[PDB]
Amino acid sequence: GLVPRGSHMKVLVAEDQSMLRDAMCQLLTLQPDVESVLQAKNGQEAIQLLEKESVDIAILDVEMPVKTGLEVLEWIRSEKLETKVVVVTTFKRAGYFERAVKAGVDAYVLKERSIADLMQTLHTVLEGRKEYSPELMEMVMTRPNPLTEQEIAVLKGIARGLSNQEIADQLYLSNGTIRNYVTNILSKLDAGNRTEAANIAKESGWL
Amino acid sequence: HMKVLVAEDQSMLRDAMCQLLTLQPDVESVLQAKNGQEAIQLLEKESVDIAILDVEMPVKTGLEVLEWIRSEKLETKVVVVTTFKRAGYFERAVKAGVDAYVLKERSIADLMQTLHTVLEGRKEYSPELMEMVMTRPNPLTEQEIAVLKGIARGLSNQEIADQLYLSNGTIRNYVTNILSKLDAGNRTEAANIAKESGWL
Ligand SMILES: Nc1c(Br)c(OO)c(Br)c(OO)c1Br
Ligand code: BEF
Ligand code: BEF
Ligand SMILES: [Mg+2]
Ligand SMILES: [Mg+2]
Numbered sequence: 182g183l184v185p186r187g188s189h190m191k192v193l194v195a196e197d198q199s200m201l202r203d204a205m206c207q208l209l210t211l212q213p214d215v216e217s218v219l220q221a222k223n224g225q226e227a228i229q230l231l232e233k234e235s236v237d238i239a240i241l242d243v244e245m246p247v248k249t250g251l252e253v254l255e256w257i258r259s260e261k262l263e264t265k266v267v268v269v270t271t272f273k274r275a276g277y278f279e280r281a282v283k284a285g286v287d288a289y290v291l292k293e294r295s296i297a298d299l300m301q302t303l304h305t306v307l308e309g310r311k312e313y314s315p316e317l318m319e320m321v322m323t324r325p326n327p328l329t330e331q332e333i334a335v336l337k338g339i340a341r342g343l344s345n346q347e348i349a350d351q352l353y354l355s356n357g358t359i360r361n362y363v364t365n366i367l368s369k370l371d372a373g374n375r376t377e378a379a380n381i382a383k384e385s386g387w388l
Numbered sequence: 389h390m391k392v393l394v395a396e397d398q399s400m401l402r403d404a405m406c407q408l409l410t411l412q413p414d415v416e417s418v419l420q421a422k423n424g425q426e427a428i429q430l431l432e433k434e435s436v437d438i439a440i441l442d443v444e445m446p447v448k449t450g451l452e453v454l455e456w457i458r459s460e461k462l463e464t465k466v467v468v469v470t471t472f473k474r475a476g477y478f479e480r481a482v483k484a485g486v487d488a489y490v491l492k493e494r495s496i497a498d499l500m501q502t503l504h505t506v507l508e509g510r511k512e513y514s515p516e517l518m519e520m521v522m523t524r525p526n527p528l529t530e531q532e533i534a535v536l537k538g539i540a541r542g543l544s545n546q547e548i549a550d551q552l553y554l555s556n557g558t559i560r561n562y563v564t565n566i567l568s569k570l571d572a573g574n575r576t577e578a579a580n581i582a583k584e585s586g587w588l
Pocket of ligand 2: 242243244245269270271272292
């Protein structure tokens, strides 16, 4: 992923707040490692600019008129451009972050960061590495217990070596009902058989 | 030359504004605050020519910093710079004698220009927010407008009453409400005020 243009990078900035866009572009332009900065007020402008010339890094706000930076990210990847993408946003919504990562964003950082932080991010992605907001990583790495009350009881039974039929009896349900829960439980815990499911939910502290 | 303070809770923008201000030839120094409390604390110890204040910030807003600057009677010009178009903010800022109020739609070049403007004793009010706050609905009812137009044609209350098929007491009640609405001393003056206000 390393693009050996760290001393003369061509970037684009899409950001709909005009005072921030202007200030970002002025300071990037002054950096010795930056060759040029293309500026876009919204995601449709970004895309139009990227249709007509190459950039090494696109720096994208999420919330913008017409097309969001997430939509631009997806366009950039669908076009197979040789362009790193750095999302810079105010928003800590987990869904935006997950969407960016599913589109292979190179970095996702918050407007809590400084310009110096941003310059580091741009060198990191151009050298083929990723940078993900620590706060957003944390947020997303902590999951609820995904299991219903019944499913937990089943798993515990499973742990003790019980058959579905034995568990059925214990919970005063039909064998068919227990088999349904197990199916459900395999899918939720991304486990394969019934004993993987059991160590998965215990090791993740869910019983 | 210029000694400025910037108060702005978004870190990336505060950093970028401050670096660019610092680079300006007639800017001497730039003090930074990330909330209004920090801004008041800096202003307690250090003299500043101009304070550039965001509105929405934790703990104390720019509008509260502004008002503090004024009760303290400092020789500090104040420029508010905000994302928000909310009329209330602009109104409160002006009632506290803000020197400039501008939106983050504006450029950094515009901001510099605004700095020179306030230091020259002039004001710079967002053209958009000015137009918004000065644009209100006509304060008169349709019926009141018809009465005023009659008054402007020289008609008596009886003549207007016969024109509108109402009692002259009903016309007298329209006039009474008009006078109070418009704070006018008499019916002919009321018609003058309405006309020149663009309400007929
Ligand atoms: N992630 C996030 C964000 Br970003 C935010 O405000 O801009 C609010 Br507010 C919030 O919950 O109220 C959440 Br969760
Ligand atoms: F407009 Be936000 F910072 F994505
Ligand atoms: F935080 Be805002 F732009 F007043
Ligand atoms: Mg935006
Ligand atoms: Mg703010």
